[PDB]
């Protein structure tokens, strides 16, 4: 009965752990010990985006790497031109409680969501010279922590209902529901090929979901705290998770185990946002210590600190060409770093 | 120099700046409150996704938000006050309410947000105490070591036993309030009868005191 099922699950977990251990022979640290370090990385702030009157909770670069969307607690979604700091767009939201941003790959749409449990898709490039909500996707029983555009018609949104949902925007109804997390899902990262995505939750587990199949394929349990952020490696066969335990972790899709831990004795603040460089060599990690950190993704060595905010860094992003990294914090300021 | 289209884009950005400044000016004169409660505590009866209610007293506007926690409570960092509503008629869930208040008070992100405590049951507390069917000392064995202090502010129509029970519950919340506060925030305990109409005035006075404390704190007075 229940005892037999529990025993079977325990045996399966032990077998999975044994299989993972047998596939581990040399850590990436030993392999990359004979590699020249990145040295010291000194990014300087080139642009400061003022105009938000409340804590900035999310941002997303455009695929053209010049326009960036941002959401703050003042209930305004603002599209900035990063090169000139010009405000291309700034539109109000129905709910001031917004904690996620998404920029369509084509740039025709933006997305927002939060404590209203509704993902609002706004049409930017339209007639009548103003942006209006194109769609209101509802069906999540909890707050929306992240939303990502698969394409101009599909969107994957993770909620606090311990679930993720793939929606077709034209129909407005959930196409697929990804379940299996036992805690609030806090982040999701689309693969570069856009066929599977990793979602980190409050149960300190990161689950890899196949978008086409709709079922979880792998689960990674290395953290001991809620995973706030997740970011796919540019290759697409690895990812980095950042949790409240002040540690980042590198996981692999083909090795099924943690690769490196990015943590320090002088860091106790939780992670709020993670991102990778264009080549994936530098892992940018936003912290609660009001500043961001740069880690060597192959040697777990700190490369530099992006300290320009008077409050915690809440959102992080790197352009598709890697020219700049934009950090948005709770002091209502977005800073572009080169 | 920048081109004509770039000049017009800059002008559009300036107009957007002006609109955002105006919106922030209008939104700065409102006070945001976070309504919290466990269950059957009458949170919605305090003042007669997210349920948001706006009420104006003394020509000032108050926003009250209830969500129907450790993750979404982080968003309410700039909220002026957390209004915690407690049902004091029952005692089986009273310790659950105490643990809830301890968790909210000791939250990392709510370390500077003051709490207005509304012990929502006043008449029901009186009936429960006077009936004698339920022994309050059974749930809380501290009654033997607890005595009503000499300085008391009882109302005209009150019984010493009911007043003793009410003050015991208020003390049982304020010890948690004062245990780890560091002076950055203060709990404001109140008592309502779920029929009292002078509840928005109480929130108004408590928020005025909260704003005065913030002004004193960040202007070097405190």
């Amino acid at each position: 009965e229940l005892d037999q099922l529990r025993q079977e699950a325990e045996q399966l977990k032990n077998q999975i752990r044994d299989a993972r251990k047998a596939c581990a022979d040399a850590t990436l640290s030993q392999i990359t010990n004979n590699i020249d370090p990145v040295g010291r990385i000194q990014m300087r702030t080139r642009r400061t985006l003022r105009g938000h009157l409340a804590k900035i909770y999310a941002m997303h670069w455009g695929t053209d790497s010049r326009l960036l969307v941002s959401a703050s607690q003042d209930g305004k979604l603002i599209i900035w031109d990063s090169y000139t700091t010009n405000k291309v767009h700034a539109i109000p939201l129905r709910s001031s409680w917004v904690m996620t941003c998404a920029y369509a790959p084509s740039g025709n749409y933006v997305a927002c969501g939060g404590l209203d449990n509704i993902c609002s898709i706004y049409n930017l490039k339209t007639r009548e010279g103003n942006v209006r909500v194109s769609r209101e996707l509802a069906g999540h029983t909890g707050y929306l922590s992240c939303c990502r555009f698969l394409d101009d018609n599909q969107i994957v949104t993770s909620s606090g209902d311990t679930t993720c949902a793939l929606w077709d925007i034209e129909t407005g109804q959930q196409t697929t529901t990804f379940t299996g997390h036992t805690g609030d899902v806090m982040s999701l990262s689309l693969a570069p090929d856009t066929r599977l995505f990793v979602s980190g939750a409050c149960d300190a587990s990161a689950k890899l979901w196949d978008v086409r199949e709709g079922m979880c394929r792998q689960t990674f349990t290395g953290h001991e705290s809620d995973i706030n952020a997740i970011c796919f490696f540019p290759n697409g066969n690895a990812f980095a998770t950042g949790s409240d335990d002040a540690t980042c972790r590198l996981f692999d899709l083909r090795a099924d185990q943690e690769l490196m831990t990015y943590s320090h004795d002088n860091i106790i603040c939780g992670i709020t946002s993670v991102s990778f460089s264009k080549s994936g060599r530098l892992l940018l990690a936003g912290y609660d210590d009001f500043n961001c950190n740069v880690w060597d993704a192959l040697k777990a060595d700190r490369a530099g600190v992006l300290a320009g905010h008077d409050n915690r860094v809440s959102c992080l992003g790197v352009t598709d060409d890697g020219m700049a990294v934009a950090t948005g914090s709770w002091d209502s300021f977005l800073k572009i770093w080169n | 120099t920048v081109s004509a289209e770039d000049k017009a884009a800059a002008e559009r950005s300036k107009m957007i700046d002006k609109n955002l400044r105006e919106d922030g000016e209008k939104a700065r004169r409102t006070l945001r409150l976070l309504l919290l409660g466990a269950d059957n505590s009458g949170k919605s009866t305090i003042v007669k996704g997210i349920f948001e209610t706006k009420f104006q007293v003394d020509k000032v506007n108050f926003h009250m938000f209830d969500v129907g926690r450790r993750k979404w409570i982080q968003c309410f960092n700039d909220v002026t006050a957390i209004i915690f509503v407690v049902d004091s008629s029952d005692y089986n869930r009273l310790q659950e309410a105490l643990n809830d208040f301890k968790s909210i008070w000791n939250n990392r992100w709510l370390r500077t947000i003051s709490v207005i405590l509304f012990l929502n049951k006043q008449d029901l507390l009186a009936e429960k105490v006077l009936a004698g069917k339920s022994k309050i000392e059974d749930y809380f064995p501290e009654f033997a070591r607890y005595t009503t202090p000499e300085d008391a502010t009882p109302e005209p129509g009150e019984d010493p036993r009911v007043t003793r029970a009410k003050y015991f519950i208020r003390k049982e919340f304020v010890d948690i309030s004062t245990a780890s506060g560091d002076g950055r925030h203060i709990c404001y305990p109140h008592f309502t009868c779920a029929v009292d109409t002078e509840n928005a005035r109480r929130i108004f006075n408590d928020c005025k005191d909260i704003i005065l404390q913030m002004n004193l704190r960040e202007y070097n007075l405190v």
Partner: single-chain antibody, 231 residues
């Protein structure tokens, strides 16, 4: 998405006439508006520009001081007041919307014209004025600017409009590369500084007309002479 203009008529020289442009279907307050006149025989000629929020005002060097362009956003309308009309001013006036941000396509919609009858700038020259074409073929037209339209920000401000005789001109390609919303993919603009071209592949019905290339680098906004297409 509608600009209906009223005014015009027989005005004696030296008189005054105010003509209006009612805008419906779009956010008129966020659009910078233009008055552009075209002579009965000549081509298009920009007259005046009122910015968004009325913060910026521009006039042509030929009507400065005697023309006054204004807007009423609450009423969603545009006004052009004229003083001291002359016989060299009698033309057909168009009200044009244009919104400026990154990636925008100004001169989107041109309203129907009002017929008015009174009785340093860079030069955009179109070498060809009329060419013979047949449907299904491939044609190319070109024009040259007095100075390079390329800017330090990498944007080359060149716009192509097709009149389609009997109707108001419409935007075809903007910034010399980008395509207007709703136009077919057959049109393609290209070129470099002081030498730009527009190529039309497999011309179909409702394609013949006069093609005007104009510059947005400097606000005098010189237009091309035009290039008529005939069967």
């Amino acid at each position: 998405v509608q600009l209906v203009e009223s005014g015009g008529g027989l005005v004696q020289p030296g008189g005054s006439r105010k003509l209006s442009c009612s805008a419906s279907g779009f956010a008129f307050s966020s659009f910078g508006m233009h008055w552009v006149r075209q002579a009965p025989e000549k081509g298009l000629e920009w007259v005046a520009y009122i910015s968004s929020g009325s913060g910026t005002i521009y006039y042509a060097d030929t009507v400065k001081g005697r023309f006054t362009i204004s807007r009423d956003d609450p009423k969603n309308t545009l006004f052009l007041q004229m003083t001291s009309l002359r016989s060299e001013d009698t033309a057909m006036y168009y009200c044009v919307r244009s919104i400026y941000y990154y990636g925008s396509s100004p001169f989107d919609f041109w309203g129907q014209g009002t017929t008015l009858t009174v009785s340093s700038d860079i030069v955009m020259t179109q070498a060809t004025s009329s060419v013979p074409v047949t449907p299904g073929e491939s044609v190319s037209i070109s024009c040259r600017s007095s100075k390079s339209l390329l800017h330090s920000n990498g944007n080359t401000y060149l716009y192509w409009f097709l009149q389609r005789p009997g109707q108001s001109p419409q935007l075809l390609i903007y910034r010399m590369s980008n395509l207007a919303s709703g136009v077919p993919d057959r049109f393609s603009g290209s070129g470099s500084g002081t030498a730009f071209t527009l190529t039309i592949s497999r011309l179909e019905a409702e394609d013949v007309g006069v093609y005007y290339c104009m510059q947005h680098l400097e606000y005098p906004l010189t237009f091309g002479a035009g290039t008529k297409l005939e069967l």
